[PDB]
Enzyme design. Structure first.
Site, PDB file in Angstrom:
ATOM      1  N   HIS A 136       0.754  -1.416  -0.299  1.00  0.00           N
ATOM      2  CA  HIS A 136      -0.120   0.042  -0.107  1.00  0.00           C
ATOM      3  C   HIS A 136       0.797   1.483   0.000  1.00  0.00           C
ATOM      4  O   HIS A 136      -0.127   2.236   0.110  1.00  0.00           O
ATOM      5  CB  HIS A 136      -0.748  -0.233   1.078  1.00  0.00           C
ATOM      6  CG  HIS A 136      -0.533   0.321   2.283  1.00  0.00           C
ATOM      7  ND1 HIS A 136      -0.439  -0.461   3.843  1.00  0.00           N
ATOM      8  CD2 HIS A 136       0.008   1.914   3.128  1.00  0.00           C
ATOM      9  CE1 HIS A 136      -0.315   0.256   4.753  1.00  0.00           C
ATOM     10  NE2 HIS A 136      -0.065   1.275   3.832  1.00  0.00           N
ATOM     11  N   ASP A 184      -0.926  -7.475   2.465  1.00  0.00           N
ATOM     12  CA  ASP A 184      -0.189  -6.478   2.468  1.00  0.00           C
ATOM     13  C   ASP A 184       1.571  -5.978   1.998  1.00  0.00           C
ATOM     14  O   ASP A 184       1.719  -5.168   3.062  1.00  0.00           O
ATOM     15  CB  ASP A 184      -0.528  -5.048   3.321  1.00  0.00           C
ATOM     16  CG  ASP A 184      -0.549  -3.686   2.984  1.00  0.00           C
ATOM     17  OD1 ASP A 184       0.077  -3.332   1.636  1.00  0.00           O
ATOM     18  OD2 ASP A 184      -0.101  -2.420   3.695  1.00  0.00           O
ATOM     19  N   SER A 220       4.367   1.709   8.118  1.00  0.00           N
ATOM     20  CA  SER A 220       4.048   0.719   7.281  1.00  0.00           C
ATOM     21  C   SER A 220       4.800   0.407   5.961  1.00  0.00           C
ATOM     22  O   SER A 220       5.660   1.154   5.892  1.00  0.00           O
ATOM     23  CB  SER A 220       2.814   2.044   6.141  1.00  0.00           C
ATOM     24  OG  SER A 220       1.578   2.177   6.545  1.00  0.00           O
TER      25      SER A 220
HETATM   26  C1  LIG Z   1      -9.573   0.869   6.674  1.00  0.00           C
HETATM   27  O1  LIG Z   1      -9.005   2.044   7.753  1.00  0.00           O
HETATM   28  C2  LIG Z   1      -8.349   2.171   8.981  1.00  0.00           C
HETATM   29  C3  LIG Z   1      -6.841   1.514   8.976  1.00  0.00           C
HETATM   30  C4  LIG Z   1      -5.903   1.678   8.404  1.00  0.00           C
HETATM   31  N1  LIG Z   1      -5.965   3.459   9.125  1.00  0.00           N
HETATM   32  C5  LIG Z   1      -4.383   4.034   8.730  1.00  0.00           C
HETATM   33  C6  LIG Z   1      -2.977   3.318   8.596  1.00  0.00           C
HETATM   34  C7  LIG Z   1      -2.476   3.300   7.828  1.00  0.00           C
HETATM   35  C8  LIG Z   1      -3.093   2.472   6.550  1.00  0.00           C
HETATM   36  C9  LIG Z   1      -1.871   2.109   8.035  1.00  0.00           C
HETATM   37  C10 LIG Z   1      -1.205   2.543   9.425  1.00  0.00           C
HETATM   38  C11 LIG Z   1       0.644   1.475   9.868  1.00  0.00           C
HETATM   39  C12 LIG Z   1      -1.124   3.298  10.691  1.00  0.00           C
HETATM   40  N2  LIG Z   1      -0.689   2.790  11.415  1.00  0.00           N
HETATM   41  C13 LIG Z   1      -2.176   3.601  12.732  1.00  0.00           C
HETATM   42  C14 LIG Z   1      -2.989   3.909  11.407  1.00  0.00           C
HETATM   43  C15 LIG Z   1      -2.380   3.382  10.197  1.00  0.00           C
HETATM   44  C16 LIG Z   1      -7.162   4.150   9.593  1.00  0.00           C
HETATM   45  C17 LIG Z   1      -6.864   5.554   9.533  1.00  0.00           C
HETATM   46  O2  LIG Z   1      -6.226   4.586  11.862  1.00  0.00           O
HETATM   47  C18 LIG Z   1      -8.455   2.909   9.527  1.00  0.00           C
END
Ligand SMILES: CO[C@H]1CCN(Cc2c(C)cc(C)c3[nH]ccc23)[C@H](CO)C1
Length: 285
Positions: free
Chosen positions: A47, A97, A220
């Site tokens: 992602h 992912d 991420s």
């Molecule tokens: C479907 O959406 C939910 C899951 C992804 N979250 C964002 C997100 C990503 C994309 C990657 C990592 C490592 C994150 N670490 C903390 C938050 C966060 C969002 C908003 O929290 C809610």
């Protein structure tokens, strides 16, 4: 290679860390992390890329260097599709992912650039001082027993690394950790939470047994690491969290018992890792 071994501050202590920057950045698409896994490969989250022209969508650096490495190919896990559960009202789906960055040029290992051990390799057998009869299932029992597992991840800011201790809920706290995906905005309506939290995920975060630091979006793709007998073994890839504590610490302080982070379990993507990395002399079991 002798993987997961320090060869000091920042990248001297975590020399497998890679820093990824999005070239055309936007809100939620600025930065990622990754792990050096061989002289030609960095392991990260799918992602982190644009699906079109993946290779020109990021820069990657190792060793806390200014220089960007030349990216030859970006390999997504073939099961990955952020839009795959849109019909079930799941706006973003992070199953599988994981992605590999194939570098054009061979890395030169040094004090600030070293590979991390991967699960189900001869590198990990030797790092854990295990016998040659060791199987992938035995490595899994050693690294991910059915308990709260001491683990770590690293966050980066202006070339400085911060190591954070977290506990993987892999025992009687596993179900509670997974069900807390409902606190993530967009996952709060799904009736069966195993539709979002698949068997590809490990779960950290929360305040028991200890106050785990949470991830941010920019973490991420970073490695989720187990530290055993002065060796570092990658067991996961940071994928997604309930709350981004860099943006929204307010929300984590409201729901701290449920503030979980989800990581792709490398034991659950081994056929893909083994195939893509088959020429990297890592000795997959
Ligand atoms: C479907 O959406 C939910 C899951 C992804 N979250 C964002 C997100 C990503 C994309 C990657 C990592 C490592 C994150 N670490 C903390 C938050 C966060 C969002 C908003 O929290 C809610």
């Amino acid at each position: 290679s002798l993987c997961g071994m320090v060869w000091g501050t920042d990248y001297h202590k975590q020399p497998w860390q890679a820093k990824i920057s999005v070239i055309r950045p936007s809100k939620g698409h600025e930065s990622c992390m990754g792990a050096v896994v061989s002289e030609y490969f960095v392991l990260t989250a799918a992602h982190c890329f644009t699906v079109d022209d993946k290779e020109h969508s990021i820069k990657v650096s190792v060793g806390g260097e200014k220089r960007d490495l030349e990216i030859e190919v970006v390999l997504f896990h073939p099961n990955y599709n952020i839009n795959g559960k849109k019909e079930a009202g799941i706006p973003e789906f992070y199953d599988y992912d994981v992605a590999l960055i194939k570098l054009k040029n061979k890395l030169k290992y040094g004090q600030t650039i070293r590979p991390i051990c991967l699960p189900c390799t001869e590198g990990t057998t030797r790092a854990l001082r295990l016998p040659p009869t060791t199987t992938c299932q035995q490595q899994k029992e050693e690294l991910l027993p059915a308990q709260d597992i001491k683990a770590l991840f690293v966050s980066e800011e202006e070339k400085k690394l911060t190591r954070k201790e977290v506990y993987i809920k892999n025992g009687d706290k596993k179900g509670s950790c997974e069900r807390d995906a409902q606190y993530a905005p967009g996952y709060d309506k799904v009736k069966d939470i195993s539709e979002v939290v698949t068997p590809r995920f490990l779960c950290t975060g929360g305040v028991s047994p200890y106050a785990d630091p949470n991830t941010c979006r920019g973490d991420s793709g970073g490695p989720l690491i187990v530290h055993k007998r002065s060796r570092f073994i990658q067991v996961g890839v940071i994928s997604w969290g309930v709350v981004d504590v860099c943006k929204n610490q307010k929300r984590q302080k409201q729901v701290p018992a449920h503030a979980r982070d989800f990581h792709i379990n490398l034991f659950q993507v081994l056929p893909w890792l083994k195939e893509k990395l088959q020429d990297e002399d890592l000795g997959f079991l």
